[PDB]
DNA sequence: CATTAGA
DNA sequence: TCTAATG
């Protein structure tokens, strides 16, 4: 956690670089199990050899460990960190919709900068066009103060459209968070569940309302169950307009809301921790359900959920407010 | 790990 | 179809 810090850190830097600039999935993967192991190791690593004793720790990495221990650096880390070509890729990728793949392709052609991206708007597809457009606003964190205004609205239309809709704003915000990155609205409805062969309009009606009123400004991707767009709070009585914010809404089989909600509410740890518990308690939690565990090794049979609670009780725990879903 | 674009 | 990119 701190003893192994620099090590793991350099390791991750390394791995990342392989998978990004290089299309070296393996080495990429190498650096990671290793970083993952030395991570757990309970004692100051003193040399490659020491480390080397470890699984996934070869000679290659081990050798880096040394240099890094010896000189507080690493040449290759220096070289890459400097590397233009590589610097470029690291960066373009920031654009929403620009993955590594495309990032290399752009670079190749010579799209190193943001402006490059501009002059070449044409080489860009819709996602990345919007990505490029809201580049500033995308990189910015969402004030609760604003989260509250947004939430407010969303809940209104949803209700206005059909009163049957159930909507929940998930994530960090859900969990008290002073700022969020983007808004996650989970969404279900009664006429939709496991069997009941869809009703795409279900998603549709709402996306349509939100747009209707000018909340949703753009569409990144919309499908029968997952809409992905851009939103913006009405820039009041001018001098102050709001930044374009990433938002996503998902359709959900009412019969799988809470688990789902349980899930996306986090935290990533409270989850795992929660998860590890239902295990002992003879269960199985996953983004959509909770199944009682059978001795034969494994088992099924999806237990009935009506609130975050039920899940809790099931695993016989203490209902934990979102506020405290911290870990 | 499952959903959507796109070519 | 496969393959990228989000989450
Ligand atoms: Ca989020
Ligand atoms: Na070893
Ligand atoms: Na990106």
Named once each, the bound ligands are:
calcium ion, sodium ion
CATH topology of the largest domain: Beta Polymerase, domain 2
CATH top level label of the largest domain:
Alpha Beta
Multimeric organization:
monomer
- How is the biggest beta sheet arranged? 5 strands, mixed
Strand content: 5-15%
CATH superfamily of the largest domain: Beta Polymerase, domain 2
CATH architecture of the largest domain: 2-Layer Sandwich
**Tally of domains:** 4
Structural class: alpha+beta
**Overall radius of gyration:** 24 Å
Family: Belongs to the DNA polymerase type-X family.
Keywords: Acetylation, Cytoplasm, DNA damage, DNA repair, DNA replication, DNA synthesis, DNA-binding, DNA-directed DNA polymerase, Isopeptide bond, Lyase, Magnesium, Metal-binding, Methylation, Nucleotidyltransferase, Nucleus, Sodium, Transferase, Ubl conjugation
Subunit structure: Monomer. Binds single-stranded DNA (ssDNA). Interacts with APEX1, LIG1, LIG3, FEN1, PCNA and XRCC1. Interacts with HUWE1/ARF-BP1, STUB1/CHIP and USP47. Interacts with FAM168A.
Pfam families: DNA_pol_B_palm (PF14792), DNA_pol_B_thumb (PF14791), DNA_pol_lambd_f (PF10391), HHH_8 (PF14716)
Characterization of the model:
The protein is an alpha+beta fold and 327 residues long. It folds into four domains: 1-83, DNA polymerase beta, N-terminal domain-like (DNA polymerase, domain 1, Orthogonal Bundle); 84-140, 5' to 3' exonuclease, C-terminal subdomain (DNA polymerase, domain 1), CATH 1.10.150; 141-263, 2-Layer Sandwich (Beta Polymerase, domain 2); 264-326, DNA polymerase, thumb domain (Beta Polymerase, domain 3, 2-Layer Sandwich). It has 16 helices and nine strands. Strands 2-4-7-6-5 form a five-stranded mixed sheet, with helices on both faces. The protein has a two-stranded antiparallel sheet with strand order 1-3. The chain has a two-stranded antiparallel sheet with strand order 8-9. A hairpin with a 3-residue loop joins strand 5 (216-222) and strand 6 (226-231). The longest helix has 18 residues, at 144-161. It is globular. The two termini are 17 Å apart. Bound molecules: calcium ion and sodium ion (2 copies). One sodium ion binds next to loops. It binds a DNA duplex (7 and 7 nucleotides) through helix 7, helix 9 and strand 5. It is classed as transferase/dna. The entry lists the keywords DNA-directed DNA polymerase, DNA replication, DNA repair, nucleotidyltransferase, complex (nucleotidyltransferase-DNA, TRANSFERASE-DNA complex.
């Amino acid at each position: 956690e701190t003893l192994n810090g620099g090590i793991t850190d350099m390791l991750t830097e390394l791995a990342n670089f392989e998978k990004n600039v290089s299309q070296a999935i393996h080495k990429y993967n190498a650096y990671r199990k290793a970083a993952s192991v030395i991570a757990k190791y309970p004692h100051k690593i003193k040399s490659g050899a020491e480390a080397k004793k470890l699984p996934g720790v070869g000679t290659k990495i081990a050798e880096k460990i040394d240099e890094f221990l010896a000189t507080g650096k690493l040449r290759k880390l220096e070289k890459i960190r400097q590397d233009d070509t590589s610097s470029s890729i690291n960066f373009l990728t920031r654009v929403s919709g620009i993955g590594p793949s495309a990032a290399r392709k752009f670079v190749d052609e010579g799209i190193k900068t943001l402006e490059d991206l501009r002059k070449n708007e044409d080489k860009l597809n819709h996602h990345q066009r919007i990505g490029l457009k809201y580049f500033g606003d995308f990189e910015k964190r969402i004030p609760r103060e604003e989260m509250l205004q947004m939430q407010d609205i969303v809940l209104n239309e949803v209700k206005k459209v059909d009163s049957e809709y159930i909507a929940t704003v998930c994530g960090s915000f859900r969990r008290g968070a002073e700022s969020s990155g983007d808004m996650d609205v989970l969404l279900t409805h009664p006429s939709f569940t496991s069997e009941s062969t869809k009703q795409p309009k279900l998603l549709h009606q709402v996306v349509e309302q939100l747009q209707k009123v000018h909340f949703i400004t753009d569409t990144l991707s919309k499908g029968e169950t997952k809409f992905m767009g851009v939103c913006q709070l009405p820039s009041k009585n001018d001098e102050k307009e709001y930044p374009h914010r990433r938002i996503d809404i998902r359709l959900i089989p009412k019969d799988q809301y809470y688990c789902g909600v349980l899930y996306f509410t986090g935290s990533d740890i409270f989850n795992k921790n929660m998860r590890a518990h239902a295990l002992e308690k003879g269960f199985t939690i996953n983004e959509y359900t909770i199944r009682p565990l059978g001795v034969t090794g494994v088992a099924g049979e999806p237990l009935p959920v009506d609130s975050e609670k039920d899940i809790f009780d099931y695993i016989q725990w203490k209902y934990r407010e979102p506020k405290d879903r911290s870990e």
